[PDB]
Design a protein around this ligand. Structure first.
Ligand SMILES: NC(=O)c1ccc[n+]([C@@H]2O[C@H](COP(=O)([O-])OP(=O)(O)OC[C@H]3O[C@@H](n4cnc5c(N)ncnc54)[C@H](O)[C@@H]3O)[C@@H](O)[C@H]2O)c1
Ligand SMILES: NC(=O)c1ccc[n+]([C@@H]2O[C@H](COP(=O)([O-])OP(=O)(O)OC[C@H]3O[C@@H](n4cnc5c(N)ncnc54)[C@H](O)[C@@H]3O)[C@@H](O)[C@H]2O)c1
Ligand SMILES: NC(=O)c1ccc[n+]([C@@H]2O[C@H](COP(=O)([O-])OP(=O)(O)OC[C@H]3O[C@@H](n4cnc5c(N)ncnc54)[C@H](O)[C@@H]3O)[C@@H](O)[C@H]2O)c1
Lengths: 331, 333, 332, 332
């Protein structure tokens, strides 16, 4: 399977890393970004959050060399990308700028067979969450979205609850790590004023569509969930706090058993169940979409619960991108 | 009224700061801590969070000298050895964080204090008060009282406004809370909450809180109707309450905003504040309100299920409430 | 004096703040930035580091409105379309961090009387530091530089040392607060790879010209100083660590006395002298260029010393910008 | 060799981690600390800085059980520690409380053969730095010190410089990660007022004796070095900034070549040499004592240089403790 990575940021680089951390047919043929390949190679090899990687990797003549040679490109506009000539099966669209189906289809015009957007999409782009609705994928879907890190944490938990107890209504908060859209010192962020305030000085409220996005993958939950976020000063790992009213009376123990059973069966490699006294740093490098924290949750009564689920918003999501690439593509 | 401050920490020092900032008639006779007065004076004058204060203050002859105020320093870890009889102490501000059971705190009364105000939730038959919510329930017979927690002081005024206007069926609260002195700079042991010892500025840290049940203490109509939890995160001050509430009456988000705004203009004056600005935690450093409703941050699922957001400076807002409660006790005992 | 502010970032906003905190005869007539005025007004009023300011300020009628002060917001990217002629602009405060004298002269082409660059300049730009060489300013200098925060901290101390003891050689480190050029998580920084690594996860080495730049305002020190920086996870306040070999034998105590006397006299309101157990947060809002930390320094012998001087790299520098503006207004 | 760990903090736990990581013949027979063993086991298995370790490890019957390793947990006053019953060859003294020789000798009174203090000591305690002077260890040395993290970073660099060029004088700064002596919010620290100010809000000046301890390990350098520290808001990894006046003229490149050569030969596994654009987080888990940062340093002239060397003050130091224990095991 021949892929390119457009946008070599946190997600693009860690997608490459996670590809290298498994046995996979994926062939990464090119990387496109706005800076030179020697700097991109440096950022791939040295990671403040996830530590060093690929010590033998080198840059030479615009190629990332690992044994594997990946072309580096630095071409601002899609019409100029050589996807036909590179025989590209999938573009990993990870710049964070192209979420419109019109902007992203220009990857297909320049010769790519499929595009995977590493973010919520604008418009009705088919959106998949592994372990929740990925079996709805149709080969005719030439532009697809892997949703957000937060939706990938919430949707599996919501599915377990829907399948065992029913959901009447839910309101989610994610206490979320700082991300590249934020600023080191107070600065302007036109489309999110709060998001420009100093990222490590502040708890910063943010809007999020991740809870509503669960209705895209679990149609029964459309209109039944919404939420918000607080951005906080950690560099990685986030947590979903789901306040949910269930459709039937249950106990906290029954919820734990339902989640533990799903993690052992239908949610294997997607959800994990823990009773340990965990904190955010314990999930750095965690590849699960959703880690249910049994000790942290609380029950008000037999229908009203507050549940806690962790996610490495960088590595868990990058791993899911790779899982979706392997699932959708042929050969 | 003659008070002493036992434990000259974040809360003890900022209680003194707020006493001085309103030129209060309270007499701070003595300060007790585990270290000498020169170091304590240094900490009172220089504050990483709230800036320098009282530049003319000096440590002199074992006292803190600030104008006409001269406060004796003590360094006696044992409550049974404190000279409260000899100092004619009306109220001990108990802010060490070590004495939480009512019988531990009563030791101050054995050593000669007339009354104790614990700057924290207490266990046992301790009345717990929140200014603007139930403080007029104070009785001169209450010789040991609690000002609850910072979080309870943020949630209870909001909970009262909702109860009075719409009714509350059930509520589940989270507080995203600043790191505090119970935490550690690097991974270390915390006997009562293992997670709480993990490096404070490396982690989002789940924690238990009793603030939701305590609202049921201040507002008996809400007994059994609220619970919640906390996440400690890497900021040095200011915290936020995230209240997911099912109301008894159908309403709109805008009507909730108007109810809070009206309360902040009337029955909750100086306790709750209402904003529509694009605020972040640092905007509340030095904020003296108990609860600042963040109108733009909240979300509505439907006409009865809402997520409401309220900020609090867990240091300065709470310290200001301590001074408010002290002056109230002074006027009603 | 009629000024405009080009670039409303940390420096631009805090220069406006300091002008207003000292209710100065400088008249601020316009702000140019490529962000809308409602957001810029928000950032001016709410500051994570320095607290809220000007609560009565509003964005209204395309202006920043504060009492009788009304400031036009502009969003003009080409320096020739700037209406400095019609606005009768005496000084452009150039604080974008993007503008090499050839580019900056175009402000005068569009009608401004003089330009003040809030950073080190390349080319034939006079460089001034208040309290060290700001009297070299000549009305014929239509483009001038206020140097860097770090140069404004090091040069006053260096002048006191040169005048009392002489300097043979010095090597400086500044342990510097994070700045807007840095990144929240690992990202690319073309001319400074380390500078793109997560700002609050790392101690980050950086190059600095501040020490060599001290030779501009103190020619006696040309070739005698260099240095480097470590960027660390604080949002503001930085500290100079100067290892210096002096030209005569002295004691640490005598160095403290030279600095204290200068802070009481020729360096008044420029340098400050403390013996308190200070830490960086104690200088948030500090307006001095350089605060000598008497307790922190060490002496190896009678000629070789390590001296420590603090500076609020935001507020101290902004205050020096305002001071230089007022000096330029009184002698122009 | 049978050892116990007194004080199961950052150093104590990571010493145990490094023993297990290299499947070492050292036998850890007991751990003493002031908290229960299930909490200590949790802290050993989950580490915010260095990640999880020993997933199969468990607390059982008052012991830490890891395979065949069964480590007694104690929670005890040095007077009643059961070193006689445990047949203890070495106490790893890692509490940070016992630094003077007579306090530490109470370990020998309670039955231990030898004590290794994981800190600079007070009194006639021989101090060793692996790769610098550890072969001076004598079996008669029943109380020894491994110096500090900082000394283990500075001394190898200083030895390379001394052997190749000579050192006339040096002033060192370490920009140091926050440690367990510091506080989350402003609190009292009797022996260091600045050290109690909020650790992640501040750059915090601190005293250090590491430069003078290098004179202990390299007597040729006694009196020629001193220095200071800044504590800054990172949870691990520190850097030495050494301003040095060498006795012979050289070039920066020749310094780089001398260090690179030492790292390949006499300092193998002690010093590392890099030319990469590194930042502090790149050294989390680094086991070397001193990592020379070739790109970061600067030269004023052919005798006066600023050299930069990194160290994981937790893991590098812990690894050196294990190295010294194995050396003592082979020479006692
Ligand atoms: N970081 C997370 O936790 C996370 C989680 C889930 C989803 N995502 C999504 O992944 C996407 C990328 O996020 P990120 O965290 O990697 O951000 P990032 O800023 O780290 O990465 C973006 C990269 O793309 C490059 N780029 C920008 N414009 C470009 C262009 N025109 N052409 C090519 N390259 C360009 C940037 O220089 C940068 O290297 C976003 O859409 C984000 O919403 C991120
Ligand atoms: N920080 C907040 O946000 C906050 C808010 C509300 C309530 N409180 C509560 O107030 C109390 C104090 O909290 P803090 O944050 O100020 O803690 P702190 O650690 O800052 O202050 C405690 C002080 O007590 C001193 N002390 C300890 N043992 C002592 C003893 N035996 N005798 C005398 N002094 C002693 C310590 O040296 C320290 O100065 C706790 O009960 C805490 O729960 C704190
Ligand atoms: N952290 C570093 O970077 C570093 C580096 C080199 C050397 N050191 C030195 O190593 C020593 C330990 O430092 P640390 O960082 O591990 O500190 P720490 O605080 O993390 O560890 C000390 C441990 O000892 C325990 N303890 C306290 N009093 C005790 C007693 N009387 N009996 C038994 N156990 C007791 C504490 O509960 C704690 O777990 C200190 O001398 C320190 O200077 C630290």
């Amino acid at each position: 399977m021949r892929i390119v990575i457009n946008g070599f940021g946190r997600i693009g680089r860690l997608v490459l890393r996670q590809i290298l951390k498994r046995n996979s047919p994926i062939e990464v043929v090119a990387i496109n970004d706005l800076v030179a390949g020697d700097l991109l190679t440096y950022l791939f090899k040295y990671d403040s959050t996830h530590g060093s990687f690929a010590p033998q990797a080198t840059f030479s003549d615009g190629c990332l060399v690992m044994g594997r040679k990946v072309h580096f490109l630095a071409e601002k506009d899609v019409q100029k990308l050589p996807w036909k000539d590179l025989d590209v099966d999938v573009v990993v669209e990870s710049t964070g700028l192209f979420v419109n189906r019109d902007d992203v289809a220009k990857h297909l015009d320049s010769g790519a067979k499929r595009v995977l957007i590493t973010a919520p999409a604008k418009g009705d782009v088919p959106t998949f969450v592994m372990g929740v609705n990925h079996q709805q994928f149709d080969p005719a879907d030439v532009i697809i979205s892997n949703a957000s890190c937060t939706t990938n944490c919430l949707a599996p938990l919501a599915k377990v609850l829907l399948d065992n107890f029913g959901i009447e209504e839910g309101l989610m908060t994610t206490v979320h790590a700082a991300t590249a859209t934020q600023s080191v010192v107070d600065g302007p962020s036109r489309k999110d004023w709060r998001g420009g305030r100093g990222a490590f000085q502040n708890i910063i409220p943010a809007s999020t569509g991740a809870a509503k996005a669960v209705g895209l993958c679990l149609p029964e939950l459309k209109g039944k969930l919404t939420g918000m976020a607080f951005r906080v000063p950690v560099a990685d790992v986030s947590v979903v706090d789901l306040t949910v009213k269930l459709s039937s009376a249950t106990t906290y123990e029954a919820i734990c058993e339902a989640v533990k059973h799903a993690a052992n069966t239908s949610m294997k490699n997607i959800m994990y169940y823990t009773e340990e006294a965990v904190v955010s740093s314990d999930f750095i490098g965690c590849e699960y979409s959703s880690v249910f924290d049994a000790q942290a949750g609380v029950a008000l009564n037999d229908r009203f619960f507050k549940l806690v689920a962790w996610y490495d918003n960088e590595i868990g999501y990058a791993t899911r991108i790779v899982d979706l690439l392997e699932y959708v593509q042929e050969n």
